[PDB]
Design a protein around this ligand. Structure first.
Ligand SMILES: Cc1cc2nc3c(=O)[nH]c(=O)nc-3n(C[C@H](O)[C@H](O)[C@H](O)COP(=O)(O)OP(=O)(O)OC[C@H]3O[C@@H](n4cnc5c(N)ncnc54)[C@H](O)[C@@H]3O)c2cc1C
Ligand SMILES: Cc1cc2nc3c(=O)[nH]c(=O)nc-3n(C[C@H](O)[C@H](O)[C@H](O)COP(=O)(O)OP(=O)(O)OC[C@H]3O[C@@H](n4cnc5c(N)ncnc54)[C@H](O)[C@@H]3O)c2cc1C
Ligand SMILES: Cc1ncc(C[n+]2c([C@@](C)(O)OO)sc(CCOP(=O)(O)OP(=O)(O)O)c2C)c(N)n1
Ligand SMILES: Cc1ncc(C[n+]2c([C@@](C)(O)OO)sc(CCOP(=O)(O)OP(=O)(O)O)c2C)c(N)n1
Ligand SMILES: Cc1ncc(C[n+]2c([C@@](C)(O)OO)sc(CCOP(=O)(O)OP(=O)(O)O)c2C)c(N)n1
Ligand SMILES: COc1cc(OC)nc(NC(=O)NS(=O)(=O)N(C)S(C)(=O)=O)n1
Ligand SMILES: COc1cc(OC)nc(NC(=O)NS(=O)(=O)N(C)S(C)(=O)=O)n1
Ligand SMILES: [Mg+2]
Ligand SMILES: [Mg+2]
Ligand SMILES: [Mg+2]
Ligand SMILES: [Mg+2]
Ligand SMILES: [Mg+2]
Ligand SMILES: [Mg+2]
Ligand SMILES: [Mg+2]
Lengths: 582, 582, 287
């Protein structure tokens, strides 16, 4: 039973209806940056005793924080911005949330309805701009539609395949007094009729049937399993099938487990890509067959019967045509298959130990390896130390680049929603704000931002947000003074011809530039730099033990390369397993 | 005669054709941030001996720098970004360049043509996203279209009403070898037939006719006169009509002149808005009748015969219906009217000294005023000192807020293209990158960024760009520890109820947060803070005299209000002339 | 109702458009490609592994042949009135089922699909997805031009035929042997049927004749053919139907045969919109 701050017969501003609409959805935290078009909403937020606002220093930081809030909790992330330049600063976050299927609700202020289209002050058609980079959007044209649209926005953002939903609210609607009707029916008839049904037993029987007939099965797990960690683990106990995970599914099945093949794809382990290459049954649960995983589609799982379970019918047969397909919730499909595998346990006599040892041979001959040069800090080793000192129970957000891959390779995520990384869009500057949203949604959690010197500086302004909100955000900054990922591609495919990838000062070529410690000092955040590998273990321990925020500038040799690597559009036989830029 | 780096019969990469297409347009500086989709373009840039790249630290900084380059020179500004998150970071700059009519050409990388629409790695439909916030955009589908599209892009961006043009270039087109045809005809038949003709004498005769019949004429000058400073000054000598300027037209007619009414509009001077209120002839040259200038349209120039000259036919009669209209170049219209006013000089006997003294009375009774409290630094006084010490010959870029208005009020711009400010979109974080582009286009010029503590921090990462490129960018940071403009509207219309407008640390409430000096220290930029008004003159002098970059943290009392102020949609009789938040 | 459609069947969907696989009904096995190639590949497997598979579905076929004999396509003959179903079946007999049939949209369209045994594909030209009236007459023009030596018959309705009646001039000028088997019920029959079933036979603008001369055939379609110099004839008694259709076929060049039918006929069987197999309607009309 919800308790309003207004009488049922008392008219209130539309902005106060919008805030109460959020309260009735369970919203406890928003990331709102004020402006002329959304001032009424910000006033209505101060009148709310249950909704706390985290003021960012850039709306791109506000929406990226809303992502981290969502990715680290499963709740929808809510960000609010003003019209014009405020709304346009959310664009990178909206597209990022769409490609990674992150539940997000963005509320943008808008010019009064009478001024729309007149090139008014701080007006951009944000609905027209974001139509192709959002799951859906709205333009509220009457104050009485606020309860319905906010309910439809949260329903669309969280149900089915999650995604961002933007709600454009004109200023005159925020000021118009009205009495909200909270009992209106959502007008989503086609979407709700397209919602997948619980999986049928006939489809699940044939999947278990194909498992017993197979000899080299591989689990292809992705971001669709983030809510099925228990069901997936039970499914593995009953079948003993090795688990290869995508960059989005890391943590669904524990990386430290014996049956874990770790990540697959362009920078996946050699043994995980080997398993998919020579498999006869590919269980694609909660994936979308991205080019980063498949490469040349004709060569991807060329010998495997492909079973694709996905809640979006548009993804089944989109890039790789499967034999058996199930359109629905992979959580339910696993629950149904677990009951069949448990009753027919002794009847099926499942044992893939021969296939598992064929993979354990590749696991011992081609493991994840890094080279240690003198006293220089290997970035791979630094992340592995952070894994050890945090017991693998930390929430890790990253930027995009080489450091992003090493954070995925050399950290053993035990549960899902510990790994927050921009995979579909791959937006730099994601790590620092996403850690803000993760720390707010999990106050008692170890939150570490494994960022790169290029990604970290893009939204460095959010260091002020971390200090003001007193968030225990740790920054493990892997500093190579370069745009490392682009530098690696220059060394491999462009004869090491540097094209604007160095981030330091060419005048003082051997000086660490910029001095990231002074960025943390400017925002009153304890900071420290470590350069010798021996001092690394104590430095990371100091970062963890020091209460509140902390930044650790970890200097790394820039010639390191992410290995292994399959070039764009290549096959497994094109895998690169050795080399760097020296 | 252009000299290529390739033989006329030698095939070259599409990326090398794109760069040569820029060289043939006179491009000397680009603002490119590398990525996977645009790596071929960045390699082709290093092969160019005439095009210099300024690597930003954020693509929003890259496009804002391209604006400052354009606004401070009249040349088109060129920014380049990769696909996906790179392209989406340009969005605020594209919309900003469209609303302010800034010539700009943005080149974004794109996934190979075969992958478009497949939700590929780092793919967003940037053409679909930016269609409503660009003058035009393109999707290159064949390498042979590169010479034509680049020529059409620069022509559309610079001719007529200038604006941004985006060119999306897929990666496979950058790699495809071909022989470019530089003699292709542009396929813009409708646009070139809609190009306004030089103004007819019959229309110009009637304007001069209305000038002699008028008794209270006012010039309403805007951003359309940025290339007509000489023609406008000559027009004023021949008529003696006072000049009221918009925020975009500042500098077209000298602010220190006796006939200058300074800025008009919401925060325009009381006498400039008075002149337009009680005028009988309004010469609207190069304006668009924005709500910031007019307010309630029915009350704006209610007694005046309105003459509107504009090169965009869609702006004539859009918000205020004029009596006489001329669709064409205001530069040519002034040249034609100057010849008529010069031959018929003694025949017309123009003298408006009676109307001028009616305005000079309002000029002396309601002048721009600021109050000095103790030793606290008045932001208005600080800007006026910068005017004195730079002789008014400095290039001024600003953020958005209270500091933006005071930079427009208390600085006497002598020539156009000294005033770089986001007026149409009003995007915070514009000041610092725009100064970068201005300093690159004018290396021997005094470039000062009058920024606010909220705007400055949004793109603070570009301080690294300033140091690396060794640009003499001065930062006059007016620090009020608040989102001042929103704070002012809270004091006036929301009973001073603060809704997320304080930017400091509530724990250390009286401590300046963040410490902006350490941001400059992190990037090796000399910095200093001044708090007492007596030390202000020497501090600004030190900033100017110190070679290279410099940041001056000017602490200001936050209770200051921009005056005068006409509320949204108000009339001249609703002008607010006194008050603050104390 | 999609939930009830093939509720007990393993669904194998072969289609060249990937967007159609799993669009409305999720299949077990799917093949995205040319069904022509998929059949060629399956024929080679079924031929080599012939004796290994020992395929025989005679028990299932006889379960269907029982339903085929107990619920066959049926029409009722009232006096000497011409049953539209019977007229189409006569056209099948007299053309040996080797004619190109184009139709309009409505009741006549269904009876042309039910009571004509098409032996090869591309003999049946009918608007199915959009269901556009006025398709039959022009489509016969294009069919006759692409197949000059073929029997082209437009089984049209009086509402559909009149919509593009102007193309009768095209048929005469281009001297195309287009036959028009016009099933005239003086009504928008399909809409009339839905009125009888679901709206208590309340006529809402479905009568196409003249209410003043209520029992007069209006319009006189023979004069439309006369205006364009096309031989025409009307038949009303069922006995004269066989000779009338034979005259239409034997007369060289274009020909229009106005076949008067009782309007109370209903297309059977009928499953209402969004219904299941157990909702099938097998009997009834508007009398
Ligand atoms: C520099 C860089 C390198 C990268 N390299 C790699 C790499 O080597 N390997 C790699 O794997 N990735 C890599 N990526 C990440 C990448 O491009 C993609 O994001 C990733 O490959 C695809 O993730 P996914 O397959 O799990 O699909 P997701 O984006 O996680 O989407 C989930 C899928 O499951 C479905 N689904 C969602 N919820 C449910 C549910 N409840 N039930 C059933 N189905 C559901 C959705 O419809 C969707 O199809 C890299 C990214 C970057 C930036
Ligand atoms: C916080 C804030 C407060 C503001 N308050 C004010 C204020 O008090 N006063 C104010 O004036 N602005 C103010 N603005 C700025 C503002 O919203 C508009 O940008 C400005 O009012 C309109 O500028 P303009 O009329 O010169 O048209 P512009 O945006 O400069 O466009 C130029 C116009 O002239 C035409 N034109 C261009 N070139 C030519 C040519 N060669 N020949 C002929 N015509 C041409 C174009 O078609 C266009 O119509 C404020 C902005 C902010 C962020
Ligand atoms: C907003 C944005 N702009 C440009 C991008 C294009 N990319 C990359 C990529 C993979 O997307 O290439 O396509 S990675 C990268 C550089 C990474 O710098 P770092 O943070 O220092 O990390 P590291 O540990 O050194 O490698 C760039 C420039 C991007 N993704 N986002
Ligand atoms: C990207 C962006 N986000 C939010 C904006 C909404 N606005 C403003 C406005 C006028 O657009 O209100 O509509 S001004 C402003 C706060 C100005 O902070 P300051 O830099 O410190 O300047 P000052 O000297 O203190 O006043 C905000 C939040 C904006 N324009 N851009
Ligand atoms: C352009 C056009 N307008 C209206 C149509 C709506 N419909 C129909 C339907 C099935 O589409 O109902 O949805 S059928 C029909 C009437 C048929 O008149 P007839 O030609 O005489 O044939 P019959 O042998 O008597 O039944 C109408 C009015 C249509 N399809 N096309
Ligand atoms: C708080 O800072 C400012 C600044 C400013 O100009 C200086 N104007 C306003 N208020 C309005 O503009 N109201 S409005 O006219 O209804 N709009 C078009 S809107 C929807 O708000 O963009 N707030
Ligand atoms: C330089 O850093 C990287 C990183 C990376 O992944 C780790 N991949 C690439 N290269 C490609 O992706 N080529 S591609 O497949 O033709 N593209 C889809 S595109 C147009 O470039 O986005 N560069
Ligand atoms: Mg080691
Ligand atoms: Mg930033
Ligand atoms: Mg780096
Ligand atoms: Mg003073
Ligand atoms: Mg401020
Ligand atoms: Mg019979
Ligand atoms: Mg009919």
């Amino acid at each position: 039973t919800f308790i309003s701050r207004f009488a049922p017969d008392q008219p209130r501003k539309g902005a106060d209806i919008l805030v109460e609409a959020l309260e009735r959805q369970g919203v406890e935290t928003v990331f709102a940056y004020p402006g002329g078009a959304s001032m009424e909403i910000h006033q209505a937020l101060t009148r709310s005793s249950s909704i706390r606002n985290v003021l960012p220093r850039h709306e791109q930081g506000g929406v990226f924080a809303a992502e981290g809030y969502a990715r680290s909790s499963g709740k929808p992330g809510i960000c609010i911005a003003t019209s014009g330049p405020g709304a346009t600063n959310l664009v990178s976050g909206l597209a990022d949330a769409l490609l990674d299927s992150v539940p997000l609700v963005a509320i943008t202020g808008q010019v009064p309805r009478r001024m729309i289209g007149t090139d008014a002050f701080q007006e951009t058609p944000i609905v027209e701009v974001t139509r192709s980079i959002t799951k859906h959007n709205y333009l509220v044209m009457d104050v009485e539609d606020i309860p319905r649209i906010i309910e439809e926005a949260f329903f669309l953002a969280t149900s089915g395949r999650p995604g961002p939903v933007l709600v454009d609210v004109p200023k005159d609607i925020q000021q118009q007094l009205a009495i909200p009707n909270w009992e209106q029916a959502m007008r989503l008839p086609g979407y709700m009729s397209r919602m997948p049904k619980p999986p049928e037993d006939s489809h699940l029987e044939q999947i278990v049937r194909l498992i017993s007939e197979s000899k080299k099965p591989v689990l292809y797990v992705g971001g669709g399993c983030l809510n099925s960690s228990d069901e997936l683990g039970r499914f593995v106990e009953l079948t003993g099938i090795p688990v290869a995970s995508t960059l989005m599914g890391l943590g669904s099945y524990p990386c430290d487990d014996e049956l874990s093949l770790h990540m697959l794809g362009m920078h996946g382990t050699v043994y995980a890509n080997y398993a998919v290459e020579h498999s006869d049954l590919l269980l694609a649960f909660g994936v979308r067959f991205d080019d980063r995983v498949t490469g040349k589609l004709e060569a991807f799982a060329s010998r495997a019967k492909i079973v694709h379970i996905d809640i979006d019918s548009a993804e089944i047969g989109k890039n790789k045509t499967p034999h058996v397909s199930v359109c629905g919730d992979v959580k339910l499909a696993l629950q149904g298959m677990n009951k069949v595998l448990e009753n027919r346990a002794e009847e099926l006599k499942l044992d893939f130990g021969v296939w598992r040892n064929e993979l354990n041979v590749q696991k011992q001959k081609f493991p994840l390896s890094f080279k240690t040069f003198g006293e220089a800090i290997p970035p791979q080793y630094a992340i592995k130390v952070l894994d050890e000192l945090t017991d693998g129970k930390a929430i890790i957000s990253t930027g995009v680049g080489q450091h992003q891959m090493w954070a995925a390779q050399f950290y053993n995520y035990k549960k899902p929603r510990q790994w927050l990384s921009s995979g579909g869009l791959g937006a730099m500057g994601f790590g620092l704000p996403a850690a803000i949203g993760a720390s707010v949604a999990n106050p008692d959690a170890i939150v570490v931002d494994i960022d790169g010197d290029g990604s970290f500086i893009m939204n460095v302004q959010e260091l002020a947000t971390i200090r003001v909100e007193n968030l225990p955000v740790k920054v493990l900054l892997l500093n190579n003074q370069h745009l490392g990922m682009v530098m690696q591609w220059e060394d491999r495919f462009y004869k090491a011809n540097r094209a604007h990838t160095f981030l330091g000062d060419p005048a003082q070529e051997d000086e660490i530039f910029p001095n990231m410690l002074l960025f943390a000092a400017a925002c009153g955040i304890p900071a420290a730099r470590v350069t010798k590998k021996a001092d690394l273990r104590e430095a990371i321990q100091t970062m963890l033990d020091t209460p509140g925020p902390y930044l650790l500038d970890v200097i790394c040799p820039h010639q390191e390369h992410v290995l292994p690597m399959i070039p764009s559009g290549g096959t497994f036989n094109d895998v690169i397993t050795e080399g760097d830029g020296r």
